Design a protein around this ligand. Structure first.
Ligand SMILES: O=c1ccn(-c2cnc3c4c(ccn23)C2(CCNCC2)CO4)c(=O)[nH]1
Ligand SMILES: [Zn+2]
Length: 108
């Protein structure tokens, strides 16, 4: 139960027992960005070895209620996913992560 950066390979990002379904039609979804490109994601509660980058934004957020910040590998600066943060106190969970499945190992 261990998932790692695909590019540098050594770095543990998260474990499989951190996965959860917030699509509610699965933990694994696919979302389209503004330019029309499709990203196949995986929602997890917790992840580490990630440098965040930029302010949280809600421009075209895939989870309404939440804002997204870009996330990268500490080591190789490879784009892993985004971190989602709630915009009010009442929501739950308050924060989680949406990771690119094709950026992790093993890919599932
Ligand atoms: O919830 C999410 C998570 C990530 N994204 C996302 C992934 N790639 C982009 C992206 C932009 C905005 C959002 N995203 C652009 C649009 C044009 N101006 C620069 C930013 C270019 O690439 C979301 O759209 N929603
Ligand atoms: Zn890496």
């Amino acid at each position: 139960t261990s998932l790692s950066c695909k590019q540098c390979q050594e770095t543990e990002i998260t474990t499989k027992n951190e996965i959860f379904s917030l699509s509610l039609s699965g933990p694994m979804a696919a979302y389209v960005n503004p330019h029309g490109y499709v990203h196949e994601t995986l929602t997890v509660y917790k992840a580490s070895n990630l440098n965040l980058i930029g302010r949280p934004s809600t421009e075209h957020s895939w989870f309404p209620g939440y804002a997204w910040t870009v996330a990268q590998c500490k080591i190789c600066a490879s784009h892993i996913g985004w971190k989602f943060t709630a915009t009010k106190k009442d929501m739950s969970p308050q924060k989680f992560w949406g990771l690119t499945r094709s950026a992790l190992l093993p890919t599932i």
